[PDB]
């Protein structure tokens, strides 16, 4: 029950659980374009956007919220219309302009590079003035312009990646008030993404998990005007960490107290797995699904360390596809596979590590 | 028209065979039997060299007709069996507890990090030496030099066939092939014993439960054979069991079952010829195609969509955990094959998909 640990986990939770309107690809472009703070978008002579291929491929299939359009072009226009103070909720309240879209299309150049996360914007004005913007790395830090920080150090995340599973189990038993509100907002937000049926096999627990997870994932993908609660700057890791648990709870006890603790443990595990991991390819399901299998195991078996280690082991052995196909449906399919692996891991015991910590570290080593 | 019928029929008779135990123990038994020792009690030393990709998948596998698990009883079973039986070497053996204890004192196991390898070296109480070697794939007997029994240009022609060719073949099946398909259905249905992965009752959870149950029956070493496809019993289970379970859950059409099972076997052999493990990537492709034919008939647009979705939702490929890891991979294969029949998007068509999965399995094999 150390109070130093409680403040460290709280700061990391407040830093890694954030709202994002639209998928990372379009939202990141919109935020980077808004950071240039152009007063008159019609006074622009040239706009060059530099994106890495790893991320931003599949941006063509992503709906930009409040535009009724898909891809990079509407995301740039949306950024010119949005406010940088909104961060990844930049598309909120924007009034899409078809006039600005056609104006920008005949002025937009896209440069694609082969590198980790990168989103740079360079803009030439009709008066010679230049404006630059830059968001970099999977932690989405604004490099250009220099902004005031809520300020997690490298040593802080190093301390968190040395914590044990028991530390997260203790934390969920005495959750701060501010974190209870955050978890409840996460549950509400990600449950609101459930709309039309995407993959409904039956009425049982597993199919409700698959159907609700794939439905929330499709709602984001099509460009609906619903924010999502992302975990470690990934809206997919957010859905994967929360929706299989929200659906499991709906199919079982409908216990709001158990749901808060299981969702929180899942987010804590998802951040932990992300911090231990190195990026090169996807990981939404290997990290978010590990949070889900642990969170589901806590809902099902309580504070049982022998059960938790057995679910981590079975999940690591039944790990889904390394590479995601992308496109309009790829992520939804991987997330449905993640549901199956996380759910089925709660019924098989193996003999891939010897415990939760060794399992997360093993999945980290396979990222080569 | 009739040239294709004879080619397909010969390949069907050559690739659909009975197998008693799992490949790991059966391969050891066959390699030990290839030394053809007259008196097993006249042996001074036995060294078995195995690659790790098959050693780890053998430490808990039951050896048929022994009531024991692992490498030691498989070697003893090989000393008792006949090399003319190949993959059915453990058939009819009379296990000797005296020979087991005798051999345990003289047996050395060397483990190497390489593709499939199973070598046996034996020193006689008279100084004479006897060597055996199977490598790359079971039945590839390098030492001793043997005449080629089962049948490169025939497989090359079959590798160039279209999906339509298999759809035509299942509409006018020879009598000898209908008996083979019925024997395959009976044999693999007989492996279903105790429930392994329940999930209640649904078409999907029935497929999962029956597939994982048949796998567990083989894994524990029961003296009941399996119908293997391109050798490998796991590939036979994956190609047949999900279809047998789907048929039991929806209608009970024996005619549609025969055609769907046959198409699945035809696709499974095709995918194998167009090539590491791949039990689920090849057998599961046969299953999704066979299930799609049961569900939609001779519809090429549906079949193309089923292969595309399966290729995008492709399971693990690299199986860890152990022997239970195979049952988990086959349960994941059930989910991917079943769910692929409800989502439309990869290759673009069946042929491009089989060729694509083949290219990615090579990349996974180059990791180690
Ligand atoms: S990009 Fe991660 S699941 Fe698709
Ligand atoms: S060896 Fe093929 S699924 Fe395990
Ligand atoms: Cl096998």
XYZ file of C-alpha atoms in Angstrom, chain A residues 159-338:
180
model
C 9.838 2.649 -12.195
C 6.408 1.595 -13.475
C 7.886 -1.058 -15.804
C 9.653 -2.599 -12.717
C 6.326 -2.937 -10.758
C 4.777 -6.388 -10.040
C 1.239 -7.624 -10.880
C 0.515 -7.541 -7.095
C 1.132 -3.771 -7.152
C -1.752 -3.309 -9.655
C -3.940 -5.721 -7.578
C -3.318 -3.552 -4.484
C -4.004 -0.288 -6.424
C -7.460 -1.452 -7.613
C -8.467 -2.104 -3.950
C -7.936 1.582 -2.938
C -8.545 3.619 -6.098
C -8.351 7.433 -5.840
C -11.595 9.389 -6.513
C -10.073 11.084 -9.599
C -9.196 7.656 -11.073
C -12.717 6.222 -10.374
C -14.165 9.126 -12.469
C -11.596 8.389 -15.228
C -12.473 4.630 -15.265
C -16.242 5.412 -15.312
C -15.713 7.894 -18.182
C -13.679 5.194 -20.034
C -16.532 2.645 -19.583
C -19.176 5.130 -20.713
C -17.191 6.420 -23.709
C -16.161 3.023 -25.069
C -19.652 1.559 -24.445
C -21.147 4.474 -26.482
C -19.097 3.299 -29.517
C -21.240 0.093 -29.668
C -23.721 0.715 -32.477
C -24.651 -1.648 -35.388
C -23.954 -5.408 -35.306
C -20.620 -6.346 -36.922
C -20.023 -10.024 -36.098
C -22.891 -11.671 -34.200
C -22.622 -15.502 -34.033
C -24.942 -16.067 -31.073
C -26.316 -14.980 -27.695
C -23.610 -16.433 -25.373
C -20.772 -14.537 -23.589
C -18.067 -14.977 -26.261
C -20.254 -13.766 -29.146
C -21.443 -10.716 -27.195
C -17.739 -9.849 -26.556
C -16.858 -10.301 -30.293
C -19.940 -8.420 -31.518
C -19.534 -5.444 -29.149
C -15.747 -5.124 -29.631
C -15.955 -5.291 -33.444
C -18.946 -2.880 -33.383
C -17.066 -0.215 -31.332
C -14.032 -0.684 -33.597
C -16.131 -0.225 -36.787
C -17.803 2.914 -35.385
C -14.373 4.573 -34.946
C -13.230 3.381 -38.401
C -16.196 4.821 -40.355
C -15.687 8.324 -38.912
C -18.584 8.536 -36.461
C -18.701 11.610 -34.218
C -18.028 9.630 -31.025
C -14.770 10.028 -29.068
C -12.962 6.935 -27.853
C -10.949 6.397 -24.715
C -7.436 5.486 -25.834
C -4.896 3.623 -23.668
C -1.173 4.423 -24.240
C -2.114 6.639 -27.215
C -3.902 3.862 -29.133
C -7.645 3.824 -29.628
C -7.419 0.129 -30.628
C -5.636 -0.741 -27.384
C -8.386 1.239 -25.631
C -11.191 -0.863 -27.281
C -9.287 -4.148 -26.776
C -8.609 -3.361 -23.095
C -12.153 -2.247 -22.201
C -14.847 -3.636 -24.551
C -14.308 -7.451 -24.027
C -14.684 -6.730 -20.267
C -17.752 -4.431 -20.641
C -19.430 -7.181 -22.756
C -18.418 -9.981 -20.350
C -19.927 -7.978 -17.445
C -23.193 -7.384 -19.414
C -23.428 -11.154 -20.088
C -22.732 -11.985 -16.411
C -23.238 -10.060 -13.076
C -23.684 -6.453 -14.334
C -21.628 -5.511 -11.194
C -20.438 -1.903 -11.603
C -17.856 -2.286 -8.773
C -16.286 -5.435 -10.323
C -16.380 -3.730 -13.754
C -14.442 -0.657 -12.512
C -11.706 -2.822 -10.888
C -11.443 -5.227 -13.884
C -11.331 -2.320 -16.403
C -8.712 -0.496 -14.295
C -6.528 -3.634 -13.952
C -6.782 -4.133 -17.743
C -5.672 -0.529 -18.414
C -2.818 -0.875 -15.881
C -1.639 -4.105 -17.597
C -2.046 -2.590 -21.107
C 0.199 0.407 -20.185
C 2.708 -1.953 -18.492
C 2.942 -4.228 -21.584
C 3.366 -1.155 -23.842
C 6.181 0.264 -21.677
C 8.047 -3.055 -21.659
C 7.573 -3.495 -25.455
C 9.613 -2.008 -28.313
C 7.919 -0.792 -31.536
C 8.449 -2.029 -35.130
C 4.552 -5.008 -36.161
C 1.114 -3.938 -34.745
C 0.717 -5.065 -30.957
C -2.860 -3.781 -30.267
C -4.070 -7.289 -29.411
C -0.859 -8.651 -27.869
C -0.772 -5.694 -25.392
C -4.454 -4.737 -25.086
C -5.519 -8.396 -25.135
C -3.067 -9.184 -22.306
C -4.801 -6.428 -20.297
C -8.166 -7.991 -21.266
C -7.255 -11.580 -20.272
C -5.889 -10.327 -16.915
C -8.923 -8.080 -16.316
C -11.364 -10.876 -17.292
C -9.475 -13.326 -15.020
C -9.868 -10.878 -12.088
C -13.622 -10.520 -12.794
C -13.917 -14.358 -12.963
C -11.497 -15.487 -10.197
C -10.777 -12.427 -8.036
C -7.368 -11.748 -6.428
C -6.079 -15.261 -7.348
C -2.426 -15.041 -8.475
C -2.294 -18.732 -9.573
C -5.251 -18.127 -11.940
C -3.849 -14.820 -13.251
C -0.487 -16.434 -14.094
C -2.244 -19.307 -15.850
C -4.320 -16.938 -18.020
C -1.190 -14.883 -18.919
C 0.562 -18.158 -19.908
C -2.339 -19.517 -22.004
C -2.819 -16.113 -23.693
C 0.897 -15.935 -24.557
C 0.723 -19.461 -26.070
C -2.499 -18.658 -28.007
C -1.202 -15.279 -29.182
C -3.040 -13.950 -32.268
C -1.551 -12.851 -35.661
C 1.670 -10.787 -35.503
C 0.691 -8.624 -38.503
C -2.632 -6.788 -39.018
C -4.042 -6.491 -42.563
C -5.280 -2.920 -42.012
C -7.836 -1.694 -44.548
C -11.428 -0.950 -43.457
C -11.974 -4.287 -41.580
C -8.490 -5.684 -40.639
C -8.254 -4.281 -37.088
C -11.819 -5.421 -36.335
C -10.868 -8.970 -37.342
C -7.715 -8.936 -35.184
C -9.734 -7.583 -32.264
C -12.342 -10.375 -32.721
C -9.432 -12.919 -32.649
C -8.136 -11.152 -29.517
